[PDB]
Structure formats: structure tokens, C-alpha cells
Design a protein around this nucleic acid. Structure first.
Ligand SMILES: [Mg+2]
Ligand SMILES: [Mg+2]
Ligand SMILES: [Mg+2]
Ligand SMILES: [Mg+2]
Ligand SMILES: [Mg+2]
Ligand SMILES: [Mg+2]
Ligand SMILES: [Mg+2]
Ligand SMILES: [Mg+2]
Ligand SMILES: [Mg+2]
Ligand SMILES: [Mg+2]
Ligand SMILES: [Mg+2]
Ligand SMILES: [Mg+2]
Ligand SMILES: [Mg+2]
Ligand SMILES: [Mg+2]
Ligand SMILES: [Mg+2]
Lengths: 62, 194, 129, 234, 122
RNA sequence: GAGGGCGUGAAACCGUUAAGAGGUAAACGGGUGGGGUCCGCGCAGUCCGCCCGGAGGAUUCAACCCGGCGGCGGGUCCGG
RNA sequence: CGGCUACCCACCCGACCCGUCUUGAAACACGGACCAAGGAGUCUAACACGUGCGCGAGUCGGGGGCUCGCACGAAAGCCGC
């Protein structure tokens, strides 16, 4: 048949942080990206699950 | 609904009032299936070997292999048969289609003139009891078994006096119906011709 | 005249036997509790025919009838009268079970409160004289 | 209030707004019903003509003492015969490309110079033949499964076909059967939309599964005899 | 701030009992037993609750006043209804249907009132 | 049933009593049957709650109005 | 009357004794007579990666000092030239 080594998507679907405000932001932006059908909402929801490394601090001059 | 009163004019009455008690976590509703009929609306099937005037063998009944004559098919799907009480002591009995063996013998019964008052509702088993708790007597009903007369004997005497002139015309039918079917050691049903 | 629960389906069990630890019959030091055999040439690990069965996720009972008693209720453990009134809304599917360390003086009060609230109790009329 | 009495008429107006929409949808659905009926009738006439012309040409050729050879069938049904384990990679890759992963499943293939050699490479593991119209009909009706997405949805309503494949003109299942049996410009999409037909085991029993059909087995070319096996596999 | 308080109360909070596979919230002002956001009676600005009367007959209804918040002394108004099995059942329904006042959990309040009246009947 | 290394008192082992069985060592998994202890029911006699039409009795309220308190909703954001 | 089971018995089928070294273990390869208790990847320093938190071109008082003697205070609070 087919091997099952790559069938599970390794991406994360839930923020590992326990911050209550971040949890509420995720609960809001998930509903937005699910209803409004906005790719911007989708990407801003995906960027909230990211860790401290995947969210680099953007400077002011940049 | 508005009805008159004694004092204060007339007050409106609301039929089908609101219920007073609500059971918690009630069961939801079904999915509204189709094609499902009650038993009273089912179509009744009959085998070609079971024709009016055919001999049947009562295998699973309380008579355990008696030969009876079939009269007609009722409305609920059960066969109304009867054996001559002089030949075999079986009254007008209800039987099942799949529970009888039909013999290839035939009897001219077209002029049966069956009454119209007897139907599936005429053959029922009614049980009643006086007390609600337990007592020594058996419900005051099964102690003296049912012995209804003047109606179970009237129709029987009306039908057998017409069936017997048709059975006694056959040279050896009153003895054949008197006899009881049985499986001996030498024959098997898969080779026997009924 | 037991308390009638809500609608209940015919609970079917995939396996009615309890899984037995390998070689737990020969030695009495080996408890009946199941332990995963991790031998390099053991028969149970490679599942030879005629050997004992290993418990896996396949034997999982139905989620609609899981944790359901044969009477049709799901048990919930209680200790006093305060933790009994919480089962007031779920009396048709959930039932009460008094703890074992509850005294006979405070047990009859729980039984009377459950009878008033029409709550099924798995162990009624217990420790009476 | 008077605003509530006017909202009472606005409710009937919204009801008419929904009613006109559903009435237009019902009329369009009836029109599509008539369309698929007419298309099925035309396809039946085309099948009649194409089946009669094959005998017409042979009869008109045999009168002059001259033989007539028909065209090679452009569609072939392939079924997997051998198991999974114990296969070379050269043939396992072709079995994966032919959408034949598990045992006892079959798919339609457009016969070309490349497909013929692809089937010859994996000949010991497949049984291929030229399907009949009734065999195609049975395989599309009984074992018909399409994938509107990465899931295998059963083919029950024509809307399932019209939503995923209606952009080419294959709105109905009769259109699908016609596009399969009369391979043309839009055959690849119609074939890829269909899930590999999971077939059951045969009834009469397969004789010498490991041997070629010519030697007396079953794994091989069964040009006209594959329908007698499809009747028992389905 | 209902969700902010629920994100703290949903766990690590008192009154919660989950010894078995089911969990119970068990608040002094709560209709059902489920530990849920739509049924919690301590975090919302409007809350309805029913309770058996302390005298031995009737049903007391507690409503969140919402006039003065953060003042638990007068934050709850308590009324007593001692009528037949239907008059109380209709008054409690009106108390939630006429006013907006958290239109949901109306059926929950009605079921709890009927269940406690069933126990008050004997 | 705490009797001078005596709180509680498990397993290996042994004695007695009861039950069952016995030529392929015993033991073990799958599926039944038989016996026994025990559990729940009282076994041709036990289902619950809602609405309506009838059969008899007792009560205040509900329709509506009035007195009146407590809470809900927004308009003027009115004096703040 | 109903009852799966941690009770006993019988028949039918399948069923070699567990653990590790090994390509190969039931082996005429090793350890185990049985039972109860104890028994084996810990801690410190350093490094690398990933994750959570706070601040952010800044970050860190772990080193000392201050307030009042304190069971909890061998804590916690603060330093601001
Ligand atoms: Mg794997
Ligand atoms: Mg990987
Ligand atoms: Mg090995
Ligand atoms: Mg066969
Ligand atoms: Mg003692
Ligand atoms: Mg001692
Ligand atoms: Mg003995
Ligand atoms: Mg070990
Ligand atoms: Mg070595
Ligand atoms: Mg060697
Ligand atoms: Mg070994
Ligand atoms: Mg050895
Ligand atoms: Mg040696
Ligand atoms: Mg040794
Ligand atoms: Mg130990």
C-alpha cells in the first residue's frame, strides 16, 4: 500500500503558551479566519500559534 | 373558548393548557424515516398451494399434527381453518401460513357461505382480574376456564352442517381427516410428496 | 419498583473476559494485573495462535454505552448530603454511590435525601441491622 | 404598532423573495432533468449506431470475400492480481502510478504506446482486458465512487458529479459513462475523478493465479474474456 | 469581563468536583451542574437561579441586580414564590421571557424549579 | 478473636471441613454445557411523567382592577 | 427467573518455559525450589538546541547594604549617584 511516515502534519494547531490574553486572541481570530474567509485572518491566526523564535521582534527603523 | 361566569363578566378559557411538570433531559426526536408501515397496513401474501378447500397439517399448534380443512384467508394475515368436530375435535381455529403443511388434496368448498360477523377481532384472548395485589385464587378467571357458548357453538354448527356433505362425498376422506400425520422411519419429507 | 432510567440501548461487550498477565498462573508472585511482555522471543508479544490475548485499542467499548451500569445508570461517588444535591438535574442518566467510609448515622440521611430527590442509589439499604 | 403591522407585510415580502428564488431553482432543476434525459437518449442512440456499424462494415466486407479488421480498443480495464509484499520496485512504481495499491481493484486506462508498455512491465501482477459497455455500466453504477476532495464520496446524486466535474460538460452519470466508454479529449479528468474500484473476490474461483492467461492461468491479457470475470468480481 | 474570569475559574478553582468521568461546578447560584461558561453563575453581569425555600415549601428565585457591581451584599435580589405547580412555572417563565435578562437557561431554570417542586410535594 | 518478644496478622507451606474431578504431568487461550455460593426480583401480578374527554368532595388564587414594593429597558443624559 | 465473572468440572480446536547474547532459543546454551521486604539512568558544573515567561539595545542584584527584636521571616520588600 502506502507508507505512513509523512501522513501526520507536524504543524501545530494550538498555542503551547498558557497566556489567557493570547488564548482569547486565538479564540477570536479563529472565529474570524473561519467565518470572514479572509486569508489575512488565516495568516494572522497562524502567526499567533508560533513560538518565541518564530515571532522575531521587529525594530522601529525597519 | 369564552364561557359565561357568575361575577366579573366572562373570562376566556385556554384549552390545552401548559403542562405542570417537565422531566429533565428529555429524549430528542427521531429522523423521520419512510417506507415503514404498521401491521394493519401490511400487504398479505399467500402461497399458491394454499387454496380454499385444502387440507393442512397443524404442526406447531397444540394439536401436534392434525389434518384440518382451510376455509378462507382473514384480513390480518392468518388462516381461518376448521376440522369437523365429529371427525377431529378442533373448532374454528386461527393458524399461521408458514406454520402449516398444505396437502395436494382438494375439497369442493366454493359454496361454503361463510358468515361475515366472524373476523380477526372475533378470535381474541381476554384476561381480567379483580385484585391488584397477590392472593390465593388465580385472578378469579383462569380457575374456571373460558366456556363461552351459544356463539362459539352456533357458528360451528352452522359451518360443519355445510362442510360435512362435501367431505362425506369423498370415499375415504372422513378417515383421512380423522387420522393424525406422523413421520415414520422409512420416509423423509424431502422425498415425500405432500 | 426500581427507579426507571432514561432510554438505554442493549450494551454489547467486545470482550467479557479480563486480560490475564502472561505466566501468572504458574507463579503466585505474578499478579493478575496485565503487564506488556517485552521479551525477544516471547509468544504473547508476537501473537502466536492459541496463546493469551493482548489488550489494544480495538477492544474499546462503544462511547454511547461506556461507563454504564447494567441497570442503565452511570455511577457518581458521594460523601455527604452536600455532594448529593448536585445530581439533581442528572437523575435520569447519573446515579449516586455513597462512599465506603461513610458512617451508618450519616448514611441514612443521604439515603433519605436521595429518596426525596428521586435519585437512584447503587447501594441502598446497606449496613442495616 | 403600525410599524409591526408593516413588518407583517414585510415578512410576506421576504417570504415571496425566498419563494421566487426557490421557484426559479426548481424550474432550473426541472430543465436540467430534461437536459440529462435528452442527453441519455442521444447517448443510447449513439451506442446503437456504433454497435450496429461494427457489424455493418464486416457484413459489407465479407460479401467481396475480403476480411475486415476493427480498430484496436482505446480503453482497457486493469485489475490487480498479485499481493503487496514481494514485488520489485520497477513494477511497484508502475502499480502505484496505475492507482492499483491494494489487491483486487481495477481502473480504466487509455491505451497508448506508453500505457501498453507500462502494462507489459507489470504483466505478472495485473489482469487487463477490453471492457464491455455493460461492464462499464455496472462498474460505474454499483462500485462508483468519486473524490470531490481528498475523501471518497459515494456517487448517489448527480450534483456530486456536476459540482466537481461539471466544468467540462460531464454533469450527469450518463455523461460520465459516455466519456469513459468513448474516450476523447476529457477522459483523464473523468478517470482521475473516479476512485479505484474496490472489487470483491471472484465467484467461480481464479485458476492458476500465478500463471499467465495464455498458459492456462489468469494474470495476462483477457481482451474479450475479462467481462466474464468482471461479472463474478462485481 | 466574563471570559477573562472564566479562563481562571474553568480550572484551579474551588467548588469543582470531577472525581468520576463527569465534572460538576456546584456554585451557590447555578441551575445545572455542568461546569460550563454558559451556566456559570459567578462571572456574568446577569444571573438567574432557583432554590428550595428554607421554610419547607415554595421556591426562592435569586436574580443578579446588576445595578451595583462588586457589592455582593445587595448584588442579588431574592424573591419567594409559593403557588401551585403551574402558577410558579408560568411566573418563572415570564420572569425570563418578558425581560431580556439572559434569555437562555430559561429551560434550565424551569426544569430545576419543576424538579425541586417534585421533591417539595411529599 | 490482646494470655508474659502478647497491636494489626499477608504470601510461600501445612492440617481439617465442604464441593468437584482423576490413565497421555500439571497448567494455559477461543466457545459452550453442568453443578454450587452469592446477588436483584416474586415470579401466568406489576413501567414512568404530560394533555384531554367523564365519574364525587373540599380550598384560595389565577381573568380584571386597586394599594404597593423589588428588579429589568431604553427616550430627556434631565439636578449631578 | 436472569447473571459476565477471580469457584469447580467436561468435551472440540489451538497450544514446547520464561529473561537476554545471537543470523538463529523450548533447546542437550546460560539464571531461576517457593514466598515477603529492599533494589538500579540520580545530583552538581559546563555546553548545544527547542519551548514558556518578563524586559528589550539593553538585560541581570545571584555580591553586599537598608527598614523593627520576631513562630511562619535561612522568606519576602527596597537600593537608583
Ligand atoms: Mg508502521
Ligand atoms: Mg519525520
Ligand atoms: Mg527474535
Ligand atoms: Mg461458492
Ligand atoms: Mg487484639
Ligand atoms: Mg499480636
Ligand atoms: Mg472429597
Ligand atoms: Mg525483566
Ligand atoms: Mg557478546
Ligand atoms: Mg554462534
Ligand atoms: Mg529464549
Ligand atoms: Mg536453558
Ligand atoms: Mg553446560
Ligand atoms: Mg540452575
Ligand atoms: Mg518492592
Amino acid at each position: 500500500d502506502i507508507r505512513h511516515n509523512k501522513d501526520r502534519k507536524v504543524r501545530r494547531k494550538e498555542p503551547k503558551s498558557q497566556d489567557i490574553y493570547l488564548r482569547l486572541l486565538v479564540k477570536l481570530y479563529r472565529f474570524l479566519a473561519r467565518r470572514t474567509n479572509s486569508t489575512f485572518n488565516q495568516v494572522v491566526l497562524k502567526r499567533l500559534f508560533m513560538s518565541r523564535t518564530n515571532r522575531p521582534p521587529l525594530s522601529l527603523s525597519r | 373558548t369564552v364561557g359565561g361566569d357568575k361575577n366579573g363578566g366572562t373570562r376566556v378559557v385556554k384549552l390545552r393548557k401548559m403542562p405542570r411538570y417537565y422531566p429533565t433531559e428529555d429524549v430528542p426526536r427521531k429522523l423521520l424515516s419512510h417506507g415503514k408501515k404498521p401491521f394493519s397496513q401490511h400487504v398479505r401474501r399467500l402461497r399458491s398451494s394454499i387454496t380454499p378447500g385444502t387440507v393442512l397439517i397443524i404442526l406447531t399448534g397444540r394439536h401436534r399434527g392434525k389434518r384440518v380443512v382451510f376455509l378462507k384467508q382473514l384480513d390480518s394475515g392468518l388462516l381461518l381453518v376448521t376440522g369437523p368436530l365429529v371427525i377431529n375435535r378442533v373448532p374454528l381455529r386461527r393458524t399461521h401460513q408458514k406454520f402449516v403443511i398444505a396437502t395436494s388434496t382438494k375439497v369442493d368448498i366454493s359454496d361454503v357461505k361463510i358468515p361475515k360477523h366472524l373476523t380477526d377481532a372475533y378470535f381474541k384472548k381476554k384476561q381480567l382480574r379483580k385484585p391488584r395485589h397477590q392472593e390465593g385464587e388465580i385472578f378469579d378467571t383462569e380457575k374456571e376456564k373460558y366456556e363461552i357458548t351459544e356463539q362459539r357453538k352456533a357458528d360451528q354448527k352452522a359451518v360443519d352442517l355445510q362442510i360435512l356433505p362435501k367431505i362425506k362425498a369423498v370415499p375415504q376422506l372422513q378417515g383421512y381427516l380423522r387420522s393424525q400425520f406422523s413421520l415414520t422411519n422409512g420416509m423423509y419429507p424431502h422425498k415425500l410428496v405432500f | 419498583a426500581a427507579l426507571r432510567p432514561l432510554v438505554k440501548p442493549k450494551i454489547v461487550k467486545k470482550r467479557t473476559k479480563k486480560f490475564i498477565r502472561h505466566q501468572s498462573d504458574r507463579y503466585v508472585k505474578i499478579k493478575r494485573n496485565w503487564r506488556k511482555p517485552r521479551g525477544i522471543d516471547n509468544r504473547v508479544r508476537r501473537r502466536f495462535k492459541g496463546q493469551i490475548l493482548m489488550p489494544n485499542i480495538g477492544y474499546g467499548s462503544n462511547k454511547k454505552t461506556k461507563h454504564m451500569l447494567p441497570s442503565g445508570f452511570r455511577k457518581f461517588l458521594v460523601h455527604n448530603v452536600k455532594e448529593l444535591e448536585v445530581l439533581l438535574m442528572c437523575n435520569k442518566s447519573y446515579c449516586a454511590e455513597i462512599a465506603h467510609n461513610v458512617s451508618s448515622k450519616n448514611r441514612k440521611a443521604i439515603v433519605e435525601r436521595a429518596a426525596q430527590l428521586a435519585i437512584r442509589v447503587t447501594n441502598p439499604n446497606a449496613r442495616l441491622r | 404598532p403600525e410599524t409591526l403591522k408593516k413588518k407583517r407585510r414585510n415578512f410576506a415580502e421576504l417570504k415571496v423573495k425566498r419563494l421566487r428564488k426557490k421557484f426559479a431553482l426548481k424550474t432550473l432543476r426541472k430543465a436540467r432533468r430534461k437536459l440529462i434525459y435528452e442527453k441519455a437518449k442521444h447517448y443510447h442512440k449513439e451506442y446503437r449506431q456504433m454497435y450496429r456499424t461494427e457489424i455493418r462494415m464486416a457484413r459489407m466486407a465479407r460479401k467481396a470475400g475480403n476480411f475486415y479488421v476493427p480498430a484496436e480498443p482505446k480503453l482497457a480495464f486493469v485489475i490487480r492480481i498479485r499481493g503487496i509484499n514481494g514485488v520489485s520496485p520497477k513494477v511497484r512504481k508502475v502499480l502505484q502510478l496505475l492507482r492499483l495499491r491494494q489487491i483486487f481493484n481495477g481502473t480504466f486506462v487509455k491505451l497508448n504506446k506508453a500505457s501498453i508498455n507500462m502494462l507489459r512491465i507489470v504483466e505478472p501482477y495485473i489482469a487487463w482486458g477490453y471492457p464491455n459497455l455493460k461492464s462499464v455500466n455496472e462498474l460505474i453504477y454499483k462500485r462508483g465512487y468519486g473524490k470531490i476532495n481528498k475523501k471518497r464520496i459515494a456517487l448517489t446524486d448527480n450534483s456530486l458529479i456536476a459540482r466537481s466535474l461539471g466544468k467540462f460538460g460531464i454533469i450527469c452519470m450518463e455523461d460520465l459513462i459516455h466519456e469513459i466508454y468513448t474516450v476523447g479529449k476529457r477522459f483523464k479528468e473523468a478517470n482521475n475523478f473516479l476512485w479505484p474500484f474496490k472489487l470483491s473476490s471472484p465467484r467461480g474461483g481464479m485458476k492458476k493465479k500465478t500463471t499467465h492467461f495464455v498458459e492456462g492461468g489468469d494474470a495476462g491479457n483477457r481482451e474479450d474474456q475479462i467481462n466474464r470475470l468482471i461479472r463474478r468480481m462485481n | 469581563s466574563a471570559h477573562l474570569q472564566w479562563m481562571v475559574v474553568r480550572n484551579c478553582s474551588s467548588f469543582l468536583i470531577k472525581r468520576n468521568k463527569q465534572t460538576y461546578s456546584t456554585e451557590p447560584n447555578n441551575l445545572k451542574a455542568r461546569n460550563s461558561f454558559r451556566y456559570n453563575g459567578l462571572i456574568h453581569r446577569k444571573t438567574v437561579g432557583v432554590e428550595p425555600a428554607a421554610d419547607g415549601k415554595g421556591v426562592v428565585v435569586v436574580m443578579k441586580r446588576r445595578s451595583g457591581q462588586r457589592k455582593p451584599a445587595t448584588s442579588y435580589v431574592r424573591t419567594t414564590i409559593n403557588k401551585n405547580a403551574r402558577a410558579t412555572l408560568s411566573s418563572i417563565r415570564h420572569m425570563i421571557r418578558k425581560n431580556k435578562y439572559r434569555p437562555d437557561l430559561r429551560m434550565a431554570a424551569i426544569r430545576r424549579a419543576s424538579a425541586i417542586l417534585r421533591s417539595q410535594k411529599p
